[PDB]
Amino acid sequence: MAAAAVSSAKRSLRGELKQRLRMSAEERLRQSRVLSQKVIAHSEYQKSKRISIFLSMQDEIETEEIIKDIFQRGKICFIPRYRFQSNHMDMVRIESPEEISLLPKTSWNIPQPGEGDVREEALSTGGLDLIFMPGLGFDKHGNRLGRGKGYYDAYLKRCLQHQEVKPYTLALAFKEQICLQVPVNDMKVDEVLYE
């Protein structure tokens, strides 16, 4: 009941956000070109070695450029591999940016290793230093509006376990994706980039 009114808020906020989003492609690119640079000069990106980063859908900052800089700097790159049955996902390691273009894709047309593909899972080899966080919306207070399936909230809690120190969670967002207040229940992000 109290949870219901919370899900209503989220639902509404998601709609509006997806409205404000679905932003010409060139604008989408401009804003990404800026966040990229802000990332490249970021202390926690510079310092971190094992990185988790997502493959951008059209209503999301484009991380293509960031991924290229990840490999140039001998960082261990990881990308999500989610399962549609539940709310489960592992960060699986990719060896080169070219590999992204061979991988299969999900119903969301998001690229990830298939079933038979045995991947090095981040938490099997030391967890993650930095996780780039996707999301429909964020507020300056740090909260996140996820896509509703609870994939990242669940994964971060798994990290907390495996890892002595928790990963630095870096949210990349459009000016458009930034909200006054976002309804919440579970996990905040250390930082949100934009502007």
Which spans of this chain sit near Ni ion (rule: CB under 5 A)? 90
138 counts as binding ligand N5G under rule CB under 6 A:
no
Is 82 annotated in some ligand binding site?
Answer: no
Q: Which residues, numbered 56-95, are part of the site for Mg ion (CB under 5 A)?
A: 90-91
91 counts as binding ligand N5G under rule CB under 6 A:
no
Residue 17 vs residues 14, 36, 113, 125: alpha-carbon distances, Å: 5, 22, 29, 37
The amino acid sitting at 90 is D
3-state secondary structure of 144: strand
Closest Cα partner for 94 from 107, 81, 83? 81
Q: Give burial (CB, 10 Å; 0-12/13-18/19+) of 162.
A: middle
In the complex, least distance from residue 88 CB atom to Ni ion, rounded to whole angstroms: 6
Candidates 1-9, 78-86, 117-125, 181-189 — which segment interacts with ligand N5G by CB under 6 A? 78-86
Is 149 annotated in some ligand binding site?
Answer: yes
- Of these, 77, 93, 127, 134, which contacts ligand N5G (CB under 6 A)? 134
180 counts as binding Mg ion under rule CB under 5 A:
yes
Phi and psi at 37, nearest 5°, equal -60, -45
Instruction: Let me know how many helices (H) and strands (E) the chain has, helices first.
Output: 5, 9
Provide the binding-site residues for Mg ion, judged by CB under 5 A.
90-91, 121-123, 179-180
Provide the binding-site residues for ligand N5G, judged by CB under 6 A.
54-55, 80, 82, 84, 89, 108, 110, 134, 146-147, 149, 151-152
